[PDB]
Amino acid sequence: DWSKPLPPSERLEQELFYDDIPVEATGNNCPPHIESFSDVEMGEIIMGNIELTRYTRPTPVQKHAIPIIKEKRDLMACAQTGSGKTAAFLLPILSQIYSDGPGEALRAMKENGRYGRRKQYPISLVLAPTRELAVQIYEEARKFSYRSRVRPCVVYGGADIGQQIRDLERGCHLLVATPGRLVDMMERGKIGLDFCKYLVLDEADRMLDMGFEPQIRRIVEQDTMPPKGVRHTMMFSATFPKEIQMLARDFLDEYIFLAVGR
Ligand SMILES: Nc1ncnc2c1ncn2[C@@H]1O[C@H](COP(=O)(O)OP(=O)(O)O)[C@@H](O)[C@H]1O
């Protein structure tokens, strides 16, 4: 069902569509890396969209992070920007979702709430420090969710929350958001973190530099999100100061530390 692609759409494909660096990797029973996307199975939809995006081979961070996430192991990864981090986590996550489906849980619930008052339960949550990074992540998600049942969404401050609220209502299996706006959404009862199995923190060090830790601890520890060990968590940070080390200690479980040249 959720594994079978939908009929193509010329209109969308229009809209939608340095290496060999040594890597450090610490942790228990760390899953082996891939040299090509076909080394592991991610389904027709993913492989189909990888072709459309013209991704020949995985980048370094993609080579080690993808199989680790596929194996449902928590991850802490220090990689520079512009290294393919985004896809490194969206491909395996989206692949997992297509394979498993939404579940009879979120399925037998697609019809709740009232007209103009629907609560959404994202299966996946991605936190970014800025509207720019959030939008990028979001665009990459649309390309990989092309011809799939997954509907990506993105919310952030600095723009009307009204339009954003109306977009969420239409459905949201994967949510990209800046911490501030997401907290707003939750207080307004528009978002529930009860079924969130995938949590990604992109550029965590940048988020703390901006003082987003309170809102993030609020989002992850002071609410309804499944705890570590149950949910699958991934952290991406270019630097690794003590604050980030502590943030990883609290949010990650028996994780793998991945350093791509830094
Ligand atoms: N495996 C890949 N092969 C070829 N190009 C890629 C690959 N992964 C990402 N890119 C290119 O890099 C860009 C995305 O960079 P990005 O992943 O957003 O950096 P970051 O992860 O730090 O945000 C895309 O526009 C895409 O063309």
UniProtKB/Swiss-Prot annotation:
Residues in Helicase ATP-binding domain copies: 66-258
Variant or mutagenesis effect after changing residue 4 to R: Partial loss of ubiquitination by RNF39
Processing and modification events after translation: Phosphorylated by TBK1; the phosphorylation is required for the synergistic induction of IFNB mediated by TBK1 and DDX3X. The cytoplasmic form is highly phosphorylated in the G1/S phase of the cell cycle and much less at G2/M. Phosphorylation by CSNK1E may inhibit RNA-stimulated ATPase activity.
Region span, Involved in stimulation of ATPase activity by DNA and RNA, nucleic acid binding and unwinding and HIV-1 replication: 105-114
UniProt superkingdom: Eukaryota
Subcellular location: Cell membrane; Nucleus; Cytoplasm; Cytoplasm, Stress granule
Residues annotated to bind ATP: 55-62, 79-86
Region span, Interaction with CHUK: 5-27
Motif, DEAD box: chain positions: 202-205
Recorded consequence of changing residue 69 to T: In MRXSSB; loss-of-function mutation affecting regulation of Wnt signaling
Crosslink feature (Glycyl lysine isopeptide (Lys-Gly) (interchain with G-Cter in SUMO2)) location: 70
Phosphoserine PTM positions: 36, 38, 95, 124
UniProt effect for mutating residue 203 to Q: Loss of both ATPase and RNA helicase activities; decreased up-regulation of CDKN1A promoter activity and HNF4A-mediated MTTP transcriptional activation; no effect on the repression of cap- and IRES-dependent translation, WNT/beta catenin signaling, nor on stress granule assembly
Q motif, short sequence motif: residues: 35-63
Tissue expression summary: Widely expressed. In testis, expressed in spermatids. Expressed in epidermis and liver (at protein level).
Associated disease: Intellectual developmental disorder, X-linked, syndromic, Snijders Blok type: A disorder characterized by mild to severe intellectual disability, hypotonia, movement disorders, behavior problems, corpus callosum hypoplasia, and epilepsy. Additionally, patients manifest variable non-neurologic features such as joint hyperlaxity, skin pigmentary abnormalities, cleft lip and/or palate, hearing and visual impairment, and precocious puberty.
Other comments on record: Encoded by an chromosome X-linked gene which may escape X chromosome inactivation in females. DDX3Y, its homolog on chromosome Y, is located on the Y non-recombinant portion.
Domain-level remarks: The C-terminus (residues 536-662) is dispensable for DDX3X trafficking.
Subunit structure of this chain's protein: Homodimer; can bind RNA as a monomer and as a dimer/oligomer. Interacts with TDRD3. Directly interacts with XPO1/CRM1. The interaction with XPO1/CMR1 is dependent on the DDX3X nuclear export signal motif and XPO1 interaction with GTPase RAN in its active GTP-bound form. Weakly interacts with TBKBP1/SINTBAD. Directly interacts with TRAF3; this interaction stimulates TRAF3 'Lys-63' ubiquitination. (Microbial infection) Interacts with hepatitis B virus (HBV) polymerase in the cytoplasm; this interaction may inhibit DDX3X interaction with the IKBKE/TBK1 complex, and hence impair IKBKE/TBK1-mediated increase in IFNB production.
Record function comment: Multifunctional ATP-dependent RNA helicase. The ATPase activity can be stimulated by various ribo-and deoxynucleic acids indicative for a relaxed substrate specificity. In vitro can unwind partially double-stranded DNA with a preference for 5'-single-stranded DNA overhangs. Binds RNA G-quadruplex (rG4s) structures, including those located in the 5'-UTR of NRAS mRNA. Involved in many cellular processes, which do not necessarily require its ATPase/helicase catalytic activities. Involved in transcription regulation.
Family membership: Belongs to the DEAD box helicase family. DDX3/DED1 subfamily.
Name this polypeptide is given: ATP-dependent RNA helicase DDX3X
Protein species of origin: Homo sapiens
Gene from which this protein is expressed: DDX3X
